[PDB]
């Protein structure tokens, strides 16, 4: 016999089943597929272990199997369930754009490209492409866009599928993608030192010649300015559309680890990168203050929802709130104290402040609504997937849904 495995790589784990000639094989990255031996065809996908499996084995009856995993988790499973198909559990990284009463979550098709499923409905919206690398909707709707493995970036029109612009650029797959306040002008970056600004239709190709090894990421500023940072840790302040490095900052000799901008006026912005939590008002070429309250060095930070708070996230998920006024020894939010290494939690991915500003939605191993300054508010929850890496909030702030670890997407809608 000779049963070829899915695609190509190198097997990390495998397990033959004497019944039904089944083969529960964890190829790589917890790819625990259910194949069928001799017949040499897959039976069904099996999503649901976090940490990339560590091991699996069938019952002596063969009617079931254990699934040891790196999380520290063993999931029992019936034999019958695996064979049946279950094209679900959205892809791990997605972008969601919120336009009011209904929220739409970006998705990657279980087989190829994508499907847009709006919440509170069964309205799937499938589209075709040779496996999109990443996606972004246009400002004021009316368009849709996606990247490519070559770094090419198409922007399909909604009104007509025939109309599109394709941009060929970047040595590899395109990284960050963002649009101007104008419906026109794509902006992107990747392995190139330059930050691409490719206006579509016009097919313009303005470049941000930063002379970095690469630019790690960039974001829109309220002005025509375009904020950016690279692996040299420079916090550059360029310009949108037209490349022009108007204000330049060297907040970190190391890479800018997470940098957050506040979003009222352009009055403040800050970053922390395993060194110091610097903060500036852009008016100076150097930060207005350089927070140094953490010897273990703050990993990430996020601004208040148009207030004066400023979280500073630690590697262990610890948060230290800092007033947006140079800095003072504000009581640490201190969100996690007792726990250990037992589960999901690693990383301090994001902070979602409540509109009231009285609550911080910490999201690491799972969501917890720490009360700002001392203690916690609505800590509860506990996510199924764990490991959420993105935060989406409705203008109202009523609903945030997280998909973490590919567990699935979860939507929250508090009641009365």
């Amino acid at each position: 016999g000779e049963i070829h495995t899915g695609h190509h790589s190198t097997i990390q784990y495998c397990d033959f089943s004497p019944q039904n000639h089944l083969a529960v094989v964890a190829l790589s990255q917890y790819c625990v597929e259910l194949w069928n031996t001799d017949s040499r065809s897959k039976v069904a996908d099996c999503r649901g272990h976090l940490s990339w499996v560590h091991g699996v084995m069938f019952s002596p009856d063969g009617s079931s199997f254990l699934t040891s995993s790196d999380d520290q988790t063993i999931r029992l499973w019936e034999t019958k369930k695996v064979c049946k198909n279950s094209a679900v559990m959205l892809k791990q990284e997605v972008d969601v754009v919120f336009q009011e009463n209904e929220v739409m979550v970006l998705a990657v098709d279980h087989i190829r490209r994508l499907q847009l499923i709006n919440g509170r409905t069964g309205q799937i919206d499938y589209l075709t492409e040779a496996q999109v690398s990443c996606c972004c909707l246009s400002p004021h709707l009316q368009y849709i866009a996606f990247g490519d493995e070559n770094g090419a970036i198409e922007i399909l029109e909604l009104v007509n599928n025939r109309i599109f612009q394709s941009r060929f650029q970047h040595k590899k797959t395109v990284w960050h993608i963002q649009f101007t306040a104008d419906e026109k002008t794509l902006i992107s970056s990747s392995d190139d030192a330059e930050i691409q600004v490719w206006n579509w239709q016009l097919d313009k190709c303005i470049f941000l010649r930063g002379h970095q090894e690469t630019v790690k990421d960039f974001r829109l500023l309220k002005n025509s300015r375009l904020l950016s940072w690279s692996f040299d840790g420079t916090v550059k302040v360029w310009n949108i559309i037209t490349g022009n490095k108007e204000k330049d900052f060297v907040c970190h000799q190391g890479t800018v680890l997470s940098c957050d901008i506040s979003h009222d006026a352009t009055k403040f912005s800050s970053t922390s990168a395993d060194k110091t939590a610097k903060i500036w008002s852009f008016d100076l070429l150097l930060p207005l203050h350089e927070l140094r309250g953490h010897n273990g060095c703050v990993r990430c930070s996020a601004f208040s929802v148009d207030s004066t708070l400023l979280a500073t996230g630690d590697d262990n998920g610890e948060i230290r709130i800092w007033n947006v006024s140079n800095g003072e020894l504000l009581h640490l939010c201190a969100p996690l104290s007792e726990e250990g290494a037992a589960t999901h939690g690693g990383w301090v991915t994001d902070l979602c402040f409540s509109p009231d500003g009285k609550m911080l939605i910490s999201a690491g191993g799972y969501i917890k609504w720490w009360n700002v300054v001392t203690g916690e508010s609505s800590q509860t929850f506990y996510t199924n997937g764990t490991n959420l890496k993105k935060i989406h909030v409705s203008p109202d702030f009523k609903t945030y849904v997280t998909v973490d670890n590919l567990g699935i997407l979860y939507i929250l809608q508090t009641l009365e």
């Binding site: 190198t10 790589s28 790196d70 990284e93 790690k216 190391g254 890479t255 690693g346 990383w347």
Partner: protein, 104 residues
């Protein structure tokens, strides 16, 4: 550290997935030549996880000492399988060996 013991530890615990010599091939893990003073996720020609690719730290003794104690905790979602070296002495030895060999 004791470079000789560090070598033993490397041979025992790292060599099955990584080379340290210049132009040594990528195995399951990336070649470690030039590791010190380099940012995470930069070996050209190795396909990292996004987690390892975006950890955003510089490899050096301090960062290695913490990583090697518990890789998953330092880079959650890494595809590197390694429990960690719990004894500090052994970590120092290994790190001292890597410091020598990955420059050589």
């Amino acid at each position: 550290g004791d470079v000789e013991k560090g070598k033993k530890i490397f041979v025992q615990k790292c060599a099955q997935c990584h080379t340290v010599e210049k132009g040594g091939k990528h195995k399951t893990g990336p070649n470690l030549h030039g590791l010190f003073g380099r940012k995470t996720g930069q070996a050209p020609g190795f396909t990292y996880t996004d987690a390892n690719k975006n950890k955003g730290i510089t490899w050096k003794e301090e960062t290695l000492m913490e990583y090697l104690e518990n890789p998953k905790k330092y880079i959650p979602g890494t595809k590197m399988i390694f429990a960690g070296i719990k004894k500090k002495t052994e970590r120092e030895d290994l790190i001292a060996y890597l410091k020598k060999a990955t420059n050589e």
